[PDB]
UniProtKB/Swiss-Prot annotation:
It comes from Saccharomyces cerevisiae (strain ATCC 204508 / S288c). This is Nuclear protein STH1/NPS1. The gene is STH1. Present with 1990 molecules/cell in log phase SD medium. Residues 9-109 form the Bromo domain. It is found in: Nucleus. Interacts directly with SFH1, CSE4, histones H3, H4 and H2B, and via its N-terminus, with RSC8. Interacts with LDB7, NPL6 and RTT102. Component of the two forms of the RSC complex composed of at least either RSC1 or RSC2, and ARP7, ARP9, LDB7, NPL6, RSC3, RSC30, RSC4, RSC58, RSC6, RSC8, RSC9, SFH1, STH1, HTL1 and probably RTT102. The complexes interact with histone and histone variant components of centromeric chromatin.
C-alpha cells in the first residue's frame, strides 16, 4: 500500500474510537497542537510536541517511512498528554484508552 495510506487508515480507525460516556472521539484533543501564542506554557513543558496532523504530514513528506517511527511518534504523543494533563482527567483517560488501541493495532498489523 505505502506508509501514508496505511497510516491514513490507522488514523481513521483511531478517530472511530469513541468515549463511552458522551461518544466524543478519543482523538479529539490529539488532532492538532495548541497555538503557541495562546498556549506558550505547553511548549515550555513539552520538549517534543506531537499531534495527529503532524504524523500524517510526516508520512507524506518522507520524514516517517516505517510503522516503527509512527509508533514511536504516537507514543511520544501519548506520553506528552499523560505528562501535561492531570491523572484521571478526561484528556489523560483518552490518551490511555487510545494508546491501548494503537498498541493492539500494531500487534494485529502483520
Amino acid at each position: 500500500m505505502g506508509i501514508f495510506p496505511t497510516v491514513e487508515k490507522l488514523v481513521e480507525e483511531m478517530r472511530e474510537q469513541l468515549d463511552e460516556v458522551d461518544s466524543h472521539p478519543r482523538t479529539s484533543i490529539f488532532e492538532k497542537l495548541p497555538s503557541k501564542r495562546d498556549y506558550p506554557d505547553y511548549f515550555k513543558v513539552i520538549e517534543k510536541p506531537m499531534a495527529i496532523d503532524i504524523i500524517l504530514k510526516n508520512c507524506k513528506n518522507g520524514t516517517y517511512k516505517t510503522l516503527e517511527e509512527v509508533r514511536q511518534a504516537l507514543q511520544t504523543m501519548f506520553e506528552n498528554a499523560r505528562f501535561y494533563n492531570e491523572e484521571g482527567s478526561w484528556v489523560y483517560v483518552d490518551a490511555d484508552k487510545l494508546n491501548e488501541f494503537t498498541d493492539e493495532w500494531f500487534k494485529e498489523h502483520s
